[model samples]
Target: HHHMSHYIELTEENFESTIKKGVALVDFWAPWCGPCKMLSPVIDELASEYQGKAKICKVNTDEQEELSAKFGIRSIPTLLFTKDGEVVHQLVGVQTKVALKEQLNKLL
Candidate 1:
């Protein structure tokens, strides 16, 4: 088990710069959403599991309103996969860890 948080809390200020770096998995979620809460642990686990390989991140749609808008988000749990600063794939809702892994592995 990892002792610290592996995922980054992305805000409007750092969103662009962060995702622009390497392979990134950005979880777009809202505090009030049920599925978003359900997926938190999976996200956390992936964050640690893929620590050095990928940049795991969480973006609170409520707090990062502008960032959310830029992504054209209308769902609660949207997983955005980016590679080399460009969006390569996306998934919505609570997803299985294996499913998420496949996406990341494809990009990696």
Candidate 2:
């Protein structure tokens, strides 16, 4: 399977600039979460499907404690959709790719 270039791994260092333009879908997850692992493949598919239209990225909460805390992420698979550096949508918990795509399509 082909992975999408639209999906970038985000860190505290690059978080600000990644959200500076267009729409961005950020998946906040940790390595050990079962749901997060389950959701990864779906996220990747959407990343490929929505390439260029929006940015799809992931942030490891364990590695990015400050950034995770700033966003108030208490769960494994929290998704934040931002446009112009402002949050437009937020999802916490595992979600189906169809539901996620619906959200992304609305943003686009």
List, residue by residue over 16-61, the lDDT tens digit for candidate 2: 9988998889999888999999989888888888887889999999
Over 4 Å off, model 1: 1-4
What digit string (tens of lDDT, one per residue) describes model 1 on residues 1-108?
A: 855778999998898898887899999998899999999999999999999999999999989999888888988799999998898887898989999999899888
* Location of the lowest summed lDDT over 10 successive residues in candidate 2: 2-11
Candidate 1 yields a Cα-based lDDT of 0.91
lDDT of 1 at 28: 96
Compared with the true structure, all predictions reach lDDT values of 0.91, 0.87
Specify the poorest-scoring 10-residue window by lDDT in model 1: 1-10
